[PDB]
Design an enzyme around this catalytic site. Structure first.
Site, short mmCIF file in Angstrom:
data_model
loop_
_atom_site.label_atom_id
_atom_site.label_comp_id
_atom_site.label_asym_id
_atom_site.label_seq_id
_atom_site.Cartn_x
_atom_site.Cartn_y
_atom_site.Cartn_z
N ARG A 116 49.34 52.80 44.22
CA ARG A 116 48.42 53.92 43.96
C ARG A 116 47.09 53.77 44.69
O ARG A 116 46.74 52.68 45.16
CB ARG A 116 48.17 54.09 42.45
CG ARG A 116 47.32 53.02 41.80
CD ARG A 116 47.28 53.23 40.29
NE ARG A 116 48.62 53.30 39.74
CZ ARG A 116 49.36 52.23 39.47
NH1 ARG A 116 48.87 51.01 39.69
NH2 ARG A 116 50.58 52.37 38.98
N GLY A 162 59.04 52.06 55.94
CA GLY A 162 58.41 51.04 55.09
C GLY A 162 59.22 50.81 53.83
O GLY A 162 60.17 51.54 53.57
N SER A 207 35.54 44.83 46.14
CA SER A 207 34.47 45.74 45.70
C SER A 207 32.97 45.44 46.05
O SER A 207 32.49 44.30 46.13
CB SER A 207 34.61 45.86 44.21
OG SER A 207 33.58 46.64 43.66
N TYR A 249 35.01 40.00 37.27
CA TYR A 249 35.48 40.74 38.45
C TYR A 249 34.56 40.49 39.66
O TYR A 249 35.02 40.24 40.77
CB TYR A 249 35.52 42.23 38.13
CG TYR A 249 36.16 43.10 39.17
CD1 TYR A 249 37.54 43.12 39.32
CD2 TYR A 249 35.39 43.94 39.98
CE1 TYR A 249 38.15 43.94 40.26
CE2 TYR A 249 35.98 44.76 40.92
CZ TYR A 249 37.36 44.75 41.06
OH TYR A 249 37.97 45.56 41.99
N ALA A 250 33.26 40.56 39.41
CA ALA A 250 32.24 40.29 40.44
C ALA A 250 32.34 38.88 41.00
O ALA A 250 32.22 38.67 42.20
CB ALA A 250 30.84 40.52 39.91
N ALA A 251 32.53 37.90 40.11
CA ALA A 251 32.66 36.52 40.55
C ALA A 251 33.88 36.37 41.45
O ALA A 251 33.82 35.70 42.48
CB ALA A 251 32.77 35.57 39.36
#
Lengths: 247, 247, 246, 237
Positions: free
Chosen positions: B17, B56, B141, B154-156
């Site tokens: 997705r 694919g 991100s 998530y940031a780490a």
């Protein structure tokens, strides 16, 4: 805007030698009650002897073990009433080329260098938020920002630490708590001492100042960030590298 | 200087997705043989149907399981002869304020979002080095660079991914392999498209372009980096964010 | 796509190297390209080089007042509103700060920075009319990392990045993107001359272990100029072989 | 590693108000002999009155005129023997949308905000190199790093200042001289602004002064070519 830390309580992880040792001595000399940690009872005893003149003490901390950091912090809070300053300095290296890197070399680095900071930072947070005051200072290497061959693991952890810190800073800032990183460059330590000359010479040549730094240079930056002189500084990475990297 | 990927073989993790799907479609339309992954057999079948027109296919990959990533890459190498392009897009979120973040929320993020990249990147490396050619492109991100409340984990992981990539770039560059990151900002995904309009406006207001980006914008950047047009670009983070962050 | 058919592009400093490669690349992609040089001789050479793609060379000495503005007005009247502006014109006047002449500072600021102010301002009214504006500024890695002997050049190139970010914020609502491309060690005649042993000190700083090509910069500019980069703005794209990884 | 500046001589440009004023007061209180500048006689007088208790003084400096910066620095060097610290804080704004921006608005900014730093930094250099000691600290706005609509000129100048500083740092470092920038965010002189910060408030001029004192001191001897952001978390590079 003084650097008088009288009446403050500080926890410095990895305080037995080099940068961590200098940090603990410096905060203690500035007036803080300092608890420094080591992974061994001999390390802890040495810290206790070294900090004795300032009323500081050494404690054993194995970051890998569950509930140890949390208990230590709870004990400090109960004995001293608060924790004002947390310096996360505990870390290891397990250098290898990615092609040869073992799963355990990856995992151990992530656990000791990154997860340890998650755990300690989380644990001090309740108290700091309640008091509406705090300092968290994470020691992260220049390698986290520029990368380094042979250190995909260490670099990932140290870079992750910076991302973590920025996110935490955004969460806790409304309570006046600052969260910052200090990024040492080439500092004279055991790790830099074991280097061969072309590597050492290559490193010094990259610096604008034309020399390696001292553990005390890192301690000086940590004291600044821990003090009232840095109350409006948060989510930052302060590079103490003699000009080897200028972001 | 073309973006013709005819004859190239690409693996895109997390292709069911949004961004991952667009990346897979775009590389496939450019001429690459694309293998896209999902965590479920139904996901893999859907990828296969979607990529059928370009030759694919979809495959199942559970990044948490040992030896799955490694086996998939070996199978691709054997079936198609080489792997030219790896796009690491598989990731999850487990959002929470640090003050209530569960240990499992930390651990799962580090395993799925970061360790998965260590594993996949290591696995493709032998082949790429033998060929003296390759592209590794990591989707990281904006949160990895600026931090985000509720996303210390998530940031780490995303920041760590950037540090990893820079270090890898330095290791593999002598063999002509480039390693780069693409950093999406506010892109329209399942997690944003259905937000209240008043809330969407708070994101768009932060951009210079005044809108959420499209998954295709990320795919366009990945195609550029995967191509011969980016052969001298390595260790970079390309921000595709409509001006919400300008490093 | 990277099809620039129907687009009009102005590339400053298009006589040689990076600028020449940029002009050729945009022209080959379908754009009507006006490339500039400081002299009619330079302009004639650009015209000959771009002839097959319908491009042309024109004169631009940034030091002269009203020249930039007149050129852009002439383009607008003759060919139409500008879609793409690539600011590549620049010089170096290297010296240690200790002995740097006032003129060495001033000339750099005029040629490398004020030129971009003038050109960017002048295209803006017309480009706002177009659906898909692009301004692309060629900056150097030295602007981000600094370099001894180049306090002037570095200041101008860093300033260019600050200018670009600010402009990006102003013009985004009209669909115009503003980006920089930051070359690292790109082979030029002057680097090509260096002794082989000397070339090694530069290449050792890169992850790829080699100098880049002018075409590598042109490739990045084409990407940014195209519909493939419509959501990219206020960015600095480093094309340096890994010599700097921000 | 103290912040005792006793025996040091400091020049702070643009010291009449706000950030510049706090910087001058702070360096003076730390023990430095401080010369603060303003563009007007009234500004200079105000500085002199403010610094009187620390033996500091105000001087007129119009950066646009040739040879003024150079003469001032030479006078300081002759009177006091050396110049240890230079803080470049003098600056103006001439905000306009690029569409409307006048040539003079561009030129004034480049002259006052950027060329002034070239001139001052060049002028102090010989003395600092001879002493094998120095600090140059440039005050550059967050807008130099992130950009700002209406401020293409100001942003270009402030960003240029950072590039200049990095290059200078590389030239003078072998003599022990450090060159750094301090980048203020939203400093007090509302909710939509404070919401952009992590700390949820505007900063104080003193916060900038505190950072400058740190960088000017022996505590920052291994820090050079850096931009220290003091923005309450508005930007986290």
């Amino acid at each position: 805007s003084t650097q008088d830390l009288s009446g403050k309580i500080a926890l410095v992880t990895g305080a037995s030698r080099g940068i961590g040792a200098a940090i603990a001595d410096t905060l203690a000399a500035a007036g803080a009650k300092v608890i420094g940690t080591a992974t061994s009872e001999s390390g802890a005893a040495a810290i206790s002897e070294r900090l004795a003149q300032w009323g500081g003490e050494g404690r054993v901390l194995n970051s890998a073990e569950p509930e140890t950091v949390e208990n230590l912090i709870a004990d400090i809070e109960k004995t001293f009433g608060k924790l004002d300053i947390l310096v996360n300095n505990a870390g290891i290296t397990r250098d290898n080329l990615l092609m040869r890197m073992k799963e355990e070399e990856w995992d151990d680095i992530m656990q000791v260098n990154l997860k340890s900071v998650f755990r300690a930072s989380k644990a001090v947070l309740r108290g700091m938020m309640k008091q509406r005051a705090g300092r968290i200072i994470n020691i992260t290497s220049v390698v986290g920002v520029m990368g380094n061959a042979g250190q995909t693991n260490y670099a990932a952890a140290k870079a992750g630490l910076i991302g973590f810190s920025k996110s935490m800073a955004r969460e806790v800032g409304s309570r006046g708590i600052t969260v910052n990183c200090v990024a040492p460059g080439f500092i004279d330590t055991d790790m830099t001492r074991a280097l061969p000359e072309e590597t050492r010479q290559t490193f010094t040549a990259q610096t604008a100042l034309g020399r390696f730094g001292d553990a005390q240079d890192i301690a000086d930056a940590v004291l600044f960030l821990a003090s009232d002189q840095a109350k409006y500084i948060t989510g930052q990475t302060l590079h103490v590298n003699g000009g080897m990297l200028m972001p």
